[PDB]
PDB file of C-alpha atoms and ligand atoms in Angstrom:
ATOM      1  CA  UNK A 179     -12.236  -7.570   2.546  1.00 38.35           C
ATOM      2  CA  UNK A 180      -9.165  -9.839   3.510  1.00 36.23           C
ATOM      3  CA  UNK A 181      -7.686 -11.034   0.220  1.00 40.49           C
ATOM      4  CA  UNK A 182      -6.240 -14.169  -0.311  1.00 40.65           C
ATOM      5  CA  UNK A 183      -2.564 -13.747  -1.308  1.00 40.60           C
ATOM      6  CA  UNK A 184      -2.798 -14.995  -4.937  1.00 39.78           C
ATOM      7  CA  UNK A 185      -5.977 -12.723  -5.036  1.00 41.66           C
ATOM      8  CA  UNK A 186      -4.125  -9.969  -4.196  1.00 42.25           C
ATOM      9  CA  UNK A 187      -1.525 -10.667  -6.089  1.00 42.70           C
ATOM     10  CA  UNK A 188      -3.523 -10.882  -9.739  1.00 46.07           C
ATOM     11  CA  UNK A 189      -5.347  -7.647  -8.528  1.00 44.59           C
ATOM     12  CA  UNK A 190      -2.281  -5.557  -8.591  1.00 41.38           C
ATOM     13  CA  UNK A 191      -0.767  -7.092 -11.452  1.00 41.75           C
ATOM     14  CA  UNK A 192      -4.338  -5.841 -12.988  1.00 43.66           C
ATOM     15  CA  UNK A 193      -3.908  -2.279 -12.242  1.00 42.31           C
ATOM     16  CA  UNK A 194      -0.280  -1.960 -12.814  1.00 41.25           C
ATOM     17  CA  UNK A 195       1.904  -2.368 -10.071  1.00 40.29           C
ATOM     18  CA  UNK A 196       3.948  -5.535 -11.539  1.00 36.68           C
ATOM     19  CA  UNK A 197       7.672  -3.377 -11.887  1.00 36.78           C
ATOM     20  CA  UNK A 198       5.914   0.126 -11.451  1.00 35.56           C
ATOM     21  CA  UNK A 199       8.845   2.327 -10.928  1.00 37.22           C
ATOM     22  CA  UNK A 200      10.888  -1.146 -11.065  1.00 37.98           C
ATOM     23  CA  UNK A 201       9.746  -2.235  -8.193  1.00 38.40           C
ATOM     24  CA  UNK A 202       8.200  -6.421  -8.623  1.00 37.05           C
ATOM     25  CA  UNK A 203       4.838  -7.865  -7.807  1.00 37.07           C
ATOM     26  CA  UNK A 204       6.468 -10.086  -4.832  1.00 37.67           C
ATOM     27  CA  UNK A 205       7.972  -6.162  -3.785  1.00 35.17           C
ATOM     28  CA  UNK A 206       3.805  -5.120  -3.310  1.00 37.62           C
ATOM     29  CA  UNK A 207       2.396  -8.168  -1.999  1.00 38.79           C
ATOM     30  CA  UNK A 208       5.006  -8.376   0.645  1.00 37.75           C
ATOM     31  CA  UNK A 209       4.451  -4.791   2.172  1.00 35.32           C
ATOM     32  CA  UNK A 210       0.586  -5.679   1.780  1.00 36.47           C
ATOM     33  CA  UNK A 211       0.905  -8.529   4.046  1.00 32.87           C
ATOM     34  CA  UNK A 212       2.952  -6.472   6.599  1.00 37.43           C
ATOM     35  CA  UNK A 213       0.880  -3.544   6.738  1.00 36.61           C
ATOM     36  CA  UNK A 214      -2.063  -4.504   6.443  1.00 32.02           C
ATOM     37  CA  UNK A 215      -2.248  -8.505   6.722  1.00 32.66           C
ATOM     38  CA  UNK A 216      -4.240  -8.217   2.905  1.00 33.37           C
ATOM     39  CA  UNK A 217      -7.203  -6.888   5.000  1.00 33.00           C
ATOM     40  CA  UNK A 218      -8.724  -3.649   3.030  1.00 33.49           C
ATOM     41  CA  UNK A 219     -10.192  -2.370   6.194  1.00 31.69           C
ATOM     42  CA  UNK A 220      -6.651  -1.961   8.619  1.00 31.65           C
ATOM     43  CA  UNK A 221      -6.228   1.236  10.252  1.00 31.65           C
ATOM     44  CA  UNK A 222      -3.554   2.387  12.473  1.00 29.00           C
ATOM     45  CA  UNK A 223      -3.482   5.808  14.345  1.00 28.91           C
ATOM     46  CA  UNK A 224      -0.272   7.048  13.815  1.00 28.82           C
ATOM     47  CA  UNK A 225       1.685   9.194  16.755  1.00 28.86           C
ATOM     48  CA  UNK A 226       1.782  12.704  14.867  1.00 32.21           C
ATOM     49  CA  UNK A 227      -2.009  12.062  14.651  1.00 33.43           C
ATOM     50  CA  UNK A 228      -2.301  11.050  11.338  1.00 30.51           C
ATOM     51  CA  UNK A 229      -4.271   7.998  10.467  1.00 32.16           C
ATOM     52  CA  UNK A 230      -2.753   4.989   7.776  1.00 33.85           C
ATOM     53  CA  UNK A 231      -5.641   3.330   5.703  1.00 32.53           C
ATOM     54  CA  UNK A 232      -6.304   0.231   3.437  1.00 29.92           C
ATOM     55  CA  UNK A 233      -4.254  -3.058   2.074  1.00 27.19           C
ATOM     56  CA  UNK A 234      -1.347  -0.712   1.910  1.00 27.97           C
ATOM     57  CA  UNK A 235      -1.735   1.379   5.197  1.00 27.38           C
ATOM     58  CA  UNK A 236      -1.617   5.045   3.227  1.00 29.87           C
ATOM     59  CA  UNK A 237      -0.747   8.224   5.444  1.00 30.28           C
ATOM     60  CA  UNK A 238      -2.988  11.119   5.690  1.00 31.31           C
ATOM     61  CA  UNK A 239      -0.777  13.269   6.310  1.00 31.10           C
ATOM     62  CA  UNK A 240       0.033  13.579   2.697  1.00 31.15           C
ATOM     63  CA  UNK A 241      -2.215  11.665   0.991  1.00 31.37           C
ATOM     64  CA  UNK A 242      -6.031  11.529   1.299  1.00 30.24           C
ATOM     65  CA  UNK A 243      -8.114  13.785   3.689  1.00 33.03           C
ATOM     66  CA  UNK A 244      -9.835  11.785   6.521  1.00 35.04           C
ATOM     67  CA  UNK A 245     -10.776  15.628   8.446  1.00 31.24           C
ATOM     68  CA  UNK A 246      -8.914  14.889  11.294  1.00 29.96           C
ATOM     69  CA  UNK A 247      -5.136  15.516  10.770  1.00 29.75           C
ATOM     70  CA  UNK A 248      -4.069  18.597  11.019  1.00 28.83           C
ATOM     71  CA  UNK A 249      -1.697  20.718   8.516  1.00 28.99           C
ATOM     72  CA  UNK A 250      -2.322  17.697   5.927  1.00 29.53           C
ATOM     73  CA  UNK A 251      -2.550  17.234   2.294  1.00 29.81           C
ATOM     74  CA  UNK A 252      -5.190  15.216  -0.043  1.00 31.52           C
ATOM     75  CA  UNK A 253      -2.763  14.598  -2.589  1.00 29.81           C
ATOM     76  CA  UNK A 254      -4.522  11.843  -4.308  1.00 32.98           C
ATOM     77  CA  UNK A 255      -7.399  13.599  -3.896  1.00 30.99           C
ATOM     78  CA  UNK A 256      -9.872  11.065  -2.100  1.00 29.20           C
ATOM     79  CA  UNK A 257     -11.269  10.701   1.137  1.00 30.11           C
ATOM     80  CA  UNK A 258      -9.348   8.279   3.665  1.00 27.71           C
ATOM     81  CA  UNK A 259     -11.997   5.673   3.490  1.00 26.74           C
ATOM     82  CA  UNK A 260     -11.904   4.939   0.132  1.00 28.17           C
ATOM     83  CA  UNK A 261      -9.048   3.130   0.512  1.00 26.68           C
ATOM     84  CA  UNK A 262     -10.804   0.506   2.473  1.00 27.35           C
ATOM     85  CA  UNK A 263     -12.876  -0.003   0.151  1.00 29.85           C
ATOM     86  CA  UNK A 264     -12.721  -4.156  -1.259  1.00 32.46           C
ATOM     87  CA  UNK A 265     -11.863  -2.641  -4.714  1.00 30.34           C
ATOM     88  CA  UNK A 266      -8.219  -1.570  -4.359  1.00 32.78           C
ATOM     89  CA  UNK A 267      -8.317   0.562  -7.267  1.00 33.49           C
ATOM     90  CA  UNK A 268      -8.040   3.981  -5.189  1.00 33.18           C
ATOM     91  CA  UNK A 269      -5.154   1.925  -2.683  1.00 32.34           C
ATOM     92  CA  UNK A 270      -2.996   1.206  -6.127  1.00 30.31           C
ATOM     93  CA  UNK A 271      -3.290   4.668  -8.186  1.00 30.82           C
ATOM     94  CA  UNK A 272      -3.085   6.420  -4.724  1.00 32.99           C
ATOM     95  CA  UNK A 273       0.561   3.924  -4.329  1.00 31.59           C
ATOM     96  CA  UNK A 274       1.728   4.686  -7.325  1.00 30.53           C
ATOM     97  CA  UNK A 275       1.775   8.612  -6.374  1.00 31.36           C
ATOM     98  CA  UNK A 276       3.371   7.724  -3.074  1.00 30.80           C
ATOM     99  CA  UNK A 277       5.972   5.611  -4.808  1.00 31.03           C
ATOM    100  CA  UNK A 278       7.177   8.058  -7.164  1.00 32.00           C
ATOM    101  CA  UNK A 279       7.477  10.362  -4.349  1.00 29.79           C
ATOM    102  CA  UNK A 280      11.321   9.924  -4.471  1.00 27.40           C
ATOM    103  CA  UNK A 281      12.221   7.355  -1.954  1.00 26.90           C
ATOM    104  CA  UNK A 282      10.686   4.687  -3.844  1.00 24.79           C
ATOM    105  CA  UNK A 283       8.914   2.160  -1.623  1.00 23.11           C
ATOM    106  CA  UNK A 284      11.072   3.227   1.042  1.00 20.67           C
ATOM    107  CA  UNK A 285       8.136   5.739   2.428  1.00 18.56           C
ATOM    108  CA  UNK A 286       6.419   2.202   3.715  1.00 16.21           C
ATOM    109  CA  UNK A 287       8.198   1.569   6.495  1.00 15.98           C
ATOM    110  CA  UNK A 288       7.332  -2.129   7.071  1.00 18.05           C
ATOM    111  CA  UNK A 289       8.447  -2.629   3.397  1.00 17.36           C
ATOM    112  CA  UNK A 290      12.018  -1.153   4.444  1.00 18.51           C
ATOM    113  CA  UNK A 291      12.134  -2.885   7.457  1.00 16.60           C
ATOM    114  CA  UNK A 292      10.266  -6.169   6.875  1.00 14.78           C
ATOM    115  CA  UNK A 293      10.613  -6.438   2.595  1.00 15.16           C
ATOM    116  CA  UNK A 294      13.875  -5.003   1.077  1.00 15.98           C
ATOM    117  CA  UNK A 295      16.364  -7.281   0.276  1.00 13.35           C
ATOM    118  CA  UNK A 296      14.386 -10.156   1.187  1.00 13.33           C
ATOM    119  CA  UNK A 297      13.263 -13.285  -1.319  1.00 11.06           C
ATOM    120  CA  UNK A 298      10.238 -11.189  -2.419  1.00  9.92           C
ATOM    121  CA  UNK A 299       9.565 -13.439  -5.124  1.00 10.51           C
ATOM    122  CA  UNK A 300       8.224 -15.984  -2.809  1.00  7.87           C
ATOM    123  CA  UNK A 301       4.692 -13.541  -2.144  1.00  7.60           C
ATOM    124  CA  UNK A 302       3.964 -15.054  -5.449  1.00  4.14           C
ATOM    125  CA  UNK A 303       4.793 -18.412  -5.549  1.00  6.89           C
ATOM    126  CA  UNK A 304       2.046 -20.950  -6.707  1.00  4.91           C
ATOM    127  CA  UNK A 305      -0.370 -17.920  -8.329  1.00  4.66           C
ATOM    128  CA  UNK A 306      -1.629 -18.155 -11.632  1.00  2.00           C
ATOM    129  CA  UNK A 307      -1.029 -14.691 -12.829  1.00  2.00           C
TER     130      UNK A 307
HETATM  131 CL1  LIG B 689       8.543 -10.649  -7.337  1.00  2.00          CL
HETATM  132 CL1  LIG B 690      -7.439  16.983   7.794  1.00  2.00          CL
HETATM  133 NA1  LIG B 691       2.321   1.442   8.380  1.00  2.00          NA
HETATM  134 NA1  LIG B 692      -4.900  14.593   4.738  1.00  2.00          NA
END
């Protein structure tokens, strides 16, 4: 599913993302549209192997088993392709593990690169939420 941004948006505002570990709703939309351009089903094969999955492009390396990378961890227990799923209920609790991890949203690199300290409000703008 690609969402629309304003879709998006309200969907992770739903499940609880809006300031989870302080971190706005503009914050999460914005690394959304850079990894994944709101499209549920983006992949990317990673260098060390690994494989990133979903609207927010999550690493199996550490955090869901797709069979296929080596020395990894499930740590939110699912297999990789449930986070393409076009419910992004397993791509938001799976986030909010990876978030807490102790860089904050720092362990997306396209939201370091591409998000912080940018008007991240604006990935809002004009939704009804
Ligand atoms: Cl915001
Ligand atoms: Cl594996
Ligand atoms: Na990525
Ligand atoms: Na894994």
């Amino acid at each position: 599913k690609v969402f629309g941004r304003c879709e998006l948006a309200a969907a992770m505002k739903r499940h609880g993302l809006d300031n989870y570990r302080g971190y706005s709703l503009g914050n999460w939309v914005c690394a959304a549209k850079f990894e994944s351009n709101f499209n549920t089903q983006a992949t990317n094969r990673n260098t060390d192997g690994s494989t990133d999955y979903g609207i927010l492009q999550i690493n199996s390396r550490w955090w869901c088993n797709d069979g296929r990378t080596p020395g990894s961890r499930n740590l939110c227990n699912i297999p990789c392709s449930a986070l393409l799923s076009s419910d992004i209920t397993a791509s938001v609790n799976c986030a909010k593990k990876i978030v807490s991890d102790g860089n904050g949203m720092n362990a997306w690199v396209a939201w370091r690169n591409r998000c912080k300290g940018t008007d991240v409000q604006a990935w809002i703008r004009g939704c009804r939420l």
